Amino acid sequence: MNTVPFTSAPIEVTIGIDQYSFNVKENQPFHGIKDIPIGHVHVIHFQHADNSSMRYGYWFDCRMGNFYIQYDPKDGLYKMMEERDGAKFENIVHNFKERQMMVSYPKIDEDDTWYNLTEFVQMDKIRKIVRKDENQFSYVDSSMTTVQENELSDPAHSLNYTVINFKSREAIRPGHEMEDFLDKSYYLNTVMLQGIFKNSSNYFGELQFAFLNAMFFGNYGSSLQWHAMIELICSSATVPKHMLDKLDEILYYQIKTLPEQYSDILLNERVWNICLYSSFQKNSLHNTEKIMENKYPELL
Amino acid sequence: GAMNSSNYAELFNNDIKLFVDDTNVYRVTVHKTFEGNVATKAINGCIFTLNPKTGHLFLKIIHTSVWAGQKRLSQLAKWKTAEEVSALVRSLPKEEQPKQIIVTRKAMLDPLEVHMLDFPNIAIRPTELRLPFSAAMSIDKLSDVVMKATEPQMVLFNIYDDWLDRISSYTAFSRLTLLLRALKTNEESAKMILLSDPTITIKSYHLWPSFTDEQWITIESQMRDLILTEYGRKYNV
């Protein structure tokens, strides 16, 4: 069980750790989060009480280093940093734990929700989508644009998701225009899976990362990417049985976790109606279709 | 974006453009089978691809053989239209290629956009205009070349005959649309108006009769009266 200590909390903030959230008051003796499960990526995220503009946060994996949070009064944000001195770090964490100045990652023993949202998400793949190679953790916020959004502006602060575009020469083989537009199997299986992702695990990891940035930060480009990657599968007549069954599970947990009050801004009516009711895979997503029809019958 | 009454002069500027109408590509007769079920029999069709400034009509004849053993023909017909327009553009010298292609039906936008990905500088647009190009098969010489075709064929016409010697493109297009609207509304009455005086003939190299300027004004009036007469008949107004 790993720990992300905080130097202090000088500004009132809502702190997210994965799907959990805690309100901290201005100058409250909050010194961090303990008992963080090893084996998963994690996201620690922030919304300031005095300016809800900019949700921002840090993707990290405690296996890769010792990370802490320190408020920067110049840049006005809680920053993640790495502590290279193992013994200094262990000594700080022991003191804060002894004085019970840390909140406990509040995982229920039965509860596989975080595993189920992050099954395919790996820190090494996050670090290729979010490029800042001097840090082992990745900063994301509300306003960061995608490479595809910047094509349609600062490249260093961009989300480098895989560009998916149904009306592109990459998506459409010369001489198979109708075939490739109406059945995206070529684009899914040869171009994206064999060509770019190498396997369904990397494809699912990107889809799951896109959903979590959409949900936790309200990142609009992330929401577009999540829907494009769902639509590419649902619009393909030929998909491996194992990929369809896994996609059903992935989407079920995403729809289960989504706050009901955010469904109107996070779910695209066109894409979900098309995927569940018109697409080649309209009858392949049993679990997802059932939770969508019971939780969000309005959207459909 | 979409072409309407707000930007109507754009049709007659010096930017090469084509209208594409797919409404006569897939044509069928519906009939009873021996067992009392219903079946369709395809007949020859055509793509109507028109430069509104020059009058040049690229009439691609669609022979019934292109449907043989194909499914979902109304869907395939849009993609075959887009394939043929794409092939026509690639066949033209660069200086003759259009800068814009306007489709008369929105259902042609995605098929044409996908076939023309190699031509990112050619704009594919819809139109808010209700154009009567479906009535092209009411022009006897165009109907004749389509129905006689035994194989796929492209035929080039000038749909304005020699009118651009005497009138602007704007006026020629207005005359064409009024003639086609009348032929679409009441074909028999329109053809009666065009052919009722034997002394005015259609030249071998023309589609329409050889009307003088004064005779065209009379014809245009009779066509407007036909459209208004039919509108009164339809709506009992």
Tell me how many domains chain A contains: 2
Q: What's the domain range around A96?
A: 1-143
Contact call for B113 and A167, based on CB within 8 A? yes
Chain B interface residues (partner A, CB cutoff 8 A): 75-76, 79, 82-83, 110-111, 113-115, 117-118
Interface test with A, best of B114, B115, B124 (most A CBs within 10 A): B114
Whether residue A181 lies within 8 A of chain B, CB to CB, comes out as yes
A13 shares a domain with A114: yes
d(CA B115, CA B111): 6
Tokens found for residue B163 = 């009118």
| Record: contact B117-A181, CB cut-off 8 A | no
One domain, residues A205 and A279: yes
Question: Who contacts B166 (Cβ-Cβ below 8 Å, separation ≥6)?
Answer: B213
Do residues A243 and A180 share a domain?
A: yes
The domain boundary residue, chosen from A126, A143, A160: A143
Helix axes A241-257, A220-234, angle to 10 degrees: 150
Cβ(B190)–Cβ(B135) below 8 Å? no
A207, A253: one domain: yes
Q: Provide the residue ranges of all domains of chain B, joining segments of one domain with +.
A: 9-163, 164-237
Separation CA A221–CA A143 (nearest Å): 9
* Whether residue A300 sits in one domain with residue A151: yes
Is the separation of the CB atoms in B154 and B59 below 8 Å?
yes
Residue A1 shares a structural domain with residue A93: yes
Judge if A138 and A151 occupy the same domain: no
Same domain for A156 and A268: yes
Contacts of B117 in chain A (CB under 8 A): 167-169, 172
**If you ran DSSP here, which 8-state letter would residue A275 be given?**
I
User: What six digits make up the tokens of B196?
Assistant: 């009722």
Is B18 in contact with B55 (CB distance < 8 Å)?
Answer: no
Beta pairing partners, B29: B41
**Do A6 and A68 form a contact (C-beta atoms < 8 A)?**
yes
Handedness of CA B77, B18, B149, B159 (dihedral sign): positive
Beta carbons of A2 and A97 less than 8 angstroms apart: no
CATH number of the domain that A63 lies in? 2.60.34.20
Residues A47 and A111 both lie in one domain: yes
Min Cα separation A181/chain B (Å): 8
Residue A30 to residue A15: CA distance in whole angstroms:
11
Nearest by Cα to A224 from A127, A147, A291, A117: A147
Domain final residue, candidates A143, A163, A189: A143
Shared domain check, A177 and A80 = no
Interface residue A152 vs chain B (CB under 8 A)? no
CATH class of residue range B164-237: mainly alpha
Spatial distance between the Cα atoms of B16 and B21, rounded to a whole number of angstroms: 17
> Are A110 and A212 members of one domain?
no
Residues A104, A109, A113, A114, CA torsion sign: positive
Whether A40 and A152 map to the same domain: the answer is: no
The technique is X-ray
Could you count the other beta carbons within 10 Å of the beta carbon of residue A155?
A: 10
Question: Which CATH code, of 2.60.120.590, 3.50.50.60, 3.30.2010.10, 3.30.420.230, is assigned to B9-163?
Answer: 3.30.420.230
Q: Answer whether B9-163 and B164-237 agree in fold.
A: no
Listed in order, strand segments (DSSP E) in chain A are 2-5, 13-17, 20-24, 32-36, 42-48, 56-60, 67-72, 77-82, 103-104, 138-141
Q: What is the resolution of this structure in A?
A: 1.5
Cα dihedral across residues B70, B74, B76, B82: positive or negative: positive
A225: which DSSP letter? H
Q: With an 8 Å Cβ cutoff, are B117 and A178 in contact?
A: no
Neighbours of B71 (CB within 10 A): 7
Q: How many Å apart are CA A85 and CA A65, to the nearest integer? A: 10
* DSSP letter, residue B15: S
Query: Which of B117, B118, B122, B124 should one mutate to test binding to chain A, selecting the residue with the greatest count of A CBs within 10 A?
Result: B117
Last residue of a domain, one of A143, A160, A183: A143
Nearest residue in chain A measured CA to CA from B118: A169
Q: Which residues sit directly before a break in chain A (C to N > 2.5 Å)?
A: 152
- In chain B, the residue whose alpha carbon lies closest to the alpha carbon of A172 is B114
Which residues of B are less than 8 Å from A181 in CB distance?
A: 110-111, 114
Residue A47 backbone dihedrals phi, psi, to 5 degrees = -135, 115
CATH number of domain containing A170: 1.25.40.550
DSSP state of B237: -
